[PDB]
Every structure is written in structure tokens, then in C-alpha cells.
Write a protein that binds this ligand. Structure first.
Ligand SMILES: COC(=O)[C@@H](Cc1ccc(O)cc1)NC(=O)c1cc(C(=O)O)c2cc(/C=C/c3ccc(Cl)cc3)ccc2n1
Length: 274
């Protein structure tokens, strides 16, 4: 790839390095990820949604694997950090949640899960958009904070519902300026979820006790009242958030259904100052 003049390293990680890069031909500026190694992906090139960072190209050359993405300058994590003094305005929080739910409705409608939503993976632009990025497509230190309980319990087959869970945790964090469930281990992550939402049993979650890593000796914590979870979210927002953090993947609200939730009756598209 002498076809790309590399502007700056956007990131590393076990699965590859990404650069902001200039196409010496196009003049176009892209993010370029080189996966170090040792067609299904290309179908996604034609699946484009305003709220998903676009996959432009997949290149298998000199026995290397490169993915090319649309480039955006800021992610939600940096934006929340610079907003920590003030917080993100609720109409902008509402707008970002609405847009993320649209992105997720789109990918889920095509049976594509994200599986690792986090503020670092959510890109925003000056025109008020927010886009899903980093779908871990390379799989045919990392935060557990947004991980759905079925994954933490070793479930081999998870559903679209894992993304709803992740986005709820992100919703809550946008509102409170605090990570909802800052576990420092898998079992610490689980037990932080339990201590707030109550230890799940078959009553609220049939088949929880059949998950691979479920132990009957999990401590039994009572559910806390949601009022402490996301103050000062109003009742519509708490209602919505409660349905996104449902223990049972089959009762957790879908992306499509959340879009019809009353919380969004007054949704607008504010513009951030970046
Ligand atoms: C923020 O820092 C990061 O980690 C950024 C680096 C960065 C990238 C672009 C930028 O503009 C800015 C920064 N991301 C990645 O490395 C990264 C990795 C992957 C992957 O799978 O390996 C991505 C997959 C898609 C799928 C798209 C797709 C999915 C489903 C459908 Cl239906 C249609 C399309 C979209 C963006 C992706 N990004």
C-alpha cells in the first residue's frame, strides 16, 4: 500500500492497526486498517446507512488484508470527556440514541450484529450524526463495561439483543457522565450488573440457569430501584432504559421497537460544538 499516504496512526489492537490515510489517487481521506494474519465482508460494502461508518473497500494484496472505511474525526468517548464538566445536552443525547437505534435496526435487519459497542467505537461529525464503527469484522486490554449478561455467562449464540444492552449502558453513561457497570473482570462485571438489577433467576430470565458459565452459588442481590440508576432522566427515558437492560434477551426491546418508544416523541437533531 504505497497507494495510501498515511496521515497518522488512528489505533492499534490485537486485530490490526488503523491509519488516517490519503489515497494518493482519489485525494480522498480514509481510515485504513491493516490486519496482520496468522467475500462475506465484501457484501457489506453495498450495505450503507447514514448511521454506520461505511465500508469502502476490502483488499487482499501482497498476502495482506486491508479494510478501508469512511473517515470521521471524533468519537463519542472523546466527546464525553470534553463534555464532562457540562454533560451532553439531553436533546443531543436523545438524538444520538435515536440515530444509534436506527443504525442497529439496519444492521440487525440484515442479520449483522456488532457485539462490542462502546463509546470509543461511535463516531460523530459536525452535522450532528453519530455512526456505528468497529464491527470486529476480522473474525469471519478491552473493556467489559458494555457486555451483555448472556455473553458474560458464556452463551455461544447471542442475538441482536446484545447490542441493545450495550447501547443502554451507553445511554445511561451519556446521561450520568459515569460508566454504568465498570467491572474490572468478567465476574466483577456480572456481579456489578447483579448488584444493581438483581441477580437473575428463571423467573425473569428462563434458561439463565442453563447458560454455560451460570453458577447456582452466584450471590443473590435484590434489585435496586431504577431511580438511582440514571438521575435525572425523565420517566420515558427510564422506561426505555429499563427495557434495554432486560435480563432476558428475548424480552429486551428490539432496535425497531425502541424507535417507537414515547421517549422519542420530541426527538430532534441538535448539532454539537466540536
Ligand atoms: C474509532 O477507532 C476505531 O476503532 C475505528 C478506526 C476508525 C475507522 C473509521 C473512522 O471513520 C474513524 C476511525 N474503527 C475500526 O478500526 C473499524 C473496524 C471494523 C472491523 O470490522 O474490523 C469496522 C467495521 C465496519 C463495518 C461497517 C458495516 C457494518 C454493517 C453493515 Cl450492515 C454495513 C457496514 C465499520 C467500521 C469499522 N471500523
Amino acid at each position: 500500500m504505497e497507494n495510501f499516504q498515511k496521515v497518522e496512526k488512528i489505533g492499534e489492537g490485537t486485530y490490526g492497526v488503523v491509519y488516517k490515510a490519503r489515497n494518493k489517487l482519489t485525494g480522498e481521506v480514509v481510515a485504513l486498517k491493516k490486519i496482520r494474519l496468522d467475500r462475506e465482508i465484501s457484501l457489506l460494502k453495498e450495505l450503507n446507512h447514514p448511521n454506520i461508518v461505511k465500508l469502502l473497500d476490502v483488499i487482499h494484496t501482497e498476502n495482506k488484508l486491508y479494510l478501508v472505511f469512511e473517515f470521521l474525526h471524533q468519537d463519542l468517548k472523546k466527546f464525553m470527556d470534553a463534555s464532562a464538566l457540562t454533560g451532553i445536552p439531553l436533546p443531543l443525547i436523545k438524538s444520538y440514541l435515536f440515530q444509534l437505534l436506527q443504525g442497529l435496526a439496519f444492521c440487525h435487519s440484515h442479520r449483522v450484529l456488532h457485539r462490542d459497542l462502546k463509546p470509543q467505537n461511535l463516531l460523530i461529525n459536525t452535522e450532528g450524526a453519530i455512526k456505528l464503527a468497529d464491527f470486529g469484522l476480522a473474525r469471519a486490554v478491552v473493556t467489559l463495561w458494555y457486555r451483555a449478561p448472556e455473553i458474560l455467562l458464556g452463551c455461544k449464540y447471542y442475538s441482536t439483543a446484545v447490542d441493545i444492552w450495550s447501547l443502554g449502558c451507553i445511554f445511561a453513561e451519556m446521561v450520568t457522565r459515569r460508566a454504568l457497570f465498570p467491572g474490572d473482570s468478567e465476574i466483577d462485571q456480572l456481579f456489578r450488573i447483579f448488584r444493581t438489577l438483581g441477580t437473575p433467576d428463571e423467573v425473569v430470565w428462563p434458561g439463565v440457569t442453563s447458560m454455560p458459565d451460570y453458577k447456582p452459588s452466584f450471590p443473590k442481590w435484590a434489585r435496586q430501584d431504577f431511580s438511582k440508576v440514571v438521575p435525572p432522566l425523565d420517566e420515558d427515558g427510564r422506561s426505555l432504559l429499563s427495557q434495554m437492560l432486560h435480563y432476558d434477551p428475548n424480552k429486551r426491546i428490539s432496535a425497531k421497537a425502541a424507535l417507537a418508544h414515547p421517549f422519542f416523541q420530541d426527538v430532534t437533531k441538535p448539532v454539537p460544538h466540536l
